[PDB]
Design a binder for this molecule. Structure first.
Ligand SMILES: C[C@@H](O)[C@H](NC(=O)OP(=O)(O)OC[C@H]1O[C@@H](n2cnc3c(N)ncnc32)[C@H](O)[C@@H]1O)C(=O)O
Ligand SMILES: [Mg+2]
Length: 330
């Protein structure tokens, strides 16, 4: 694999071209976006897209998102787009919001898992936009992690996972938000399929009527304590019997000094917690602990997405009264 260091805010166009030539030749390129890194191929090339599933060991029926760099490309991959959706797409893109739309005949089965629909977004990241531009094709990509690991948000995550399994990794620094794009299905009348950095507060203003067995990393047991009023007591109860790690904001670090901590960022800046979330799950599994205990965060703004990912990551081990602890541990 060629690892290519490219400045994420002012990318060297000659370096972007090296990766774009790989895309056009049917090869795979991992690249940063504003959400998480993606592992991409030419969205029109179904054999090239199968290489993404081979690199990740991804089940073949989990479909990809097509990333576009302009509106001409939208109409190559999607059709029958309602006028209201088109007008909204023109004000939200580039940005961390993916639309599920009806596909065109040009989109391969490998991209859509055989579905009649295709998920599309225009990524708000200079490296991603310039890669797609220079490639001259939309780029299909899911998150760039190996199957059972958390979505990658910095180059080293992608390197550890995919080095030797993909043609190019673009080392483009840390992604901006750290959690995957919001996904809305606008082929039905519309449903929020995945919360993300494009918040439900903003969505509801644009789409008033919006409707709201996989194992998720980490492999270490992880409990999510939604009720902050019992957190100290859940930690007391469990740290007596287990070697624990606490996933907490920096404001609670002093209260638990002596226990292993993974600091997610500041309670006064949820974007920091979202930026650090998946890497805190990688750290948990590097440590040698019986279990992770994460505290909840407000479900406002990107909080909703943080908590969506945290619930999944915990296998829905949610603690709202301390007696809930019974259900998940001796
Ligand atoms: C690279 C960056 O753009 C990142 N992509 C990513 O994280 O994709 P990822 O979540 O691994 O895979 C694409 C997901 O997008 C959803 N998806 C794709 N096509 C769909 C369709 N036609 N209907 C419903 N959901 C779809 C599925 O949940 C599928 O698992 C992101 O969305 O921010
Ligand atoms: Mg993924």
């Amino acid at each position: 694999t060629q690892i290519i260091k490219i400045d994420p805010l002012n990318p060297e166009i000659d370096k972007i071209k090296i990766a774009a030539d790989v895309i056009r030749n049917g090869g795979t390129v991992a690249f940063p976006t504003e959400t998480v890194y993606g592992l991409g191929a030419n969205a029109f090339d179904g054999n090239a897209c199968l290489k993404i599933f081979q690199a990740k060991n991804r089940p073949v029926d989990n479909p990809l998102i097509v990333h576009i760099a302009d509106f001409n490309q939208l109409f190559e991959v999607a059709k029958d787009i309602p006028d209201k959706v088109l007008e909204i797409a023109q004000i939200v893109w580039p940005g961390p919001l993916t639309f599920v739309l009806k596909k065109t005949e040009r989109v391969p089965k490998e991209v859509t898992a055989g579905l009649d629909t295709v998920a599309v977004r225009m990524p708000a990241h200079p490296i991603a936009l310039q890669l797609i531009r220079e490639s001259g094709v939309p780029i299909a990509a899911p998150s760039a992690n190996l199957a059972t690991r958390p979505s990658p948000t910095k180059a080293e995550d992608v390197i550890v996972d995919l080095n030797g399994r993909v043609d190019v990794i673009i080392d483009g620094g840390h992604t901006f938000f750290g959690v995957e794009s919001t996904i809305i299905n606008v082929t039905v009348e519309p449903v929020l399929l995945r919360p993300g950095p494009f918040t439900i507060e903003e969505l509801k203003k644009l789409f008033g009527e919006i409707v709201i067995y996989k194992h998720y990393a980490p492999n270490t047991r992880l409990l999510l304590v939604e009720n902050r009023n019992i957190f100290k007591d859940v930690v007391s109860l469990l740290s007596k019997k287990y070697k624990v790690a606490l996933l907490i904001p920096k404001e609670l670090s002093k209260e638990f000094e002596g226990l292993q901590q993974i600091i997610l960022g500041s309670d006064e800046n949820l974007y920091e917690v979202a930026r650090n979330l998946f890497d805190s799950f990688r750290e948990l599994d590097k440590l040698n602990v019986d279990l992770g205990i994460m505290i909840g965060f407000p479900e406002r703004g990107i909080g909703f997405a943080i908590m969506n990912r945290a619930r999944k990551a915990s296998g829905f081990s949610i603690i709202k009264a301390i007696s809930d602890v019974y259900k998940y541990v001796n």
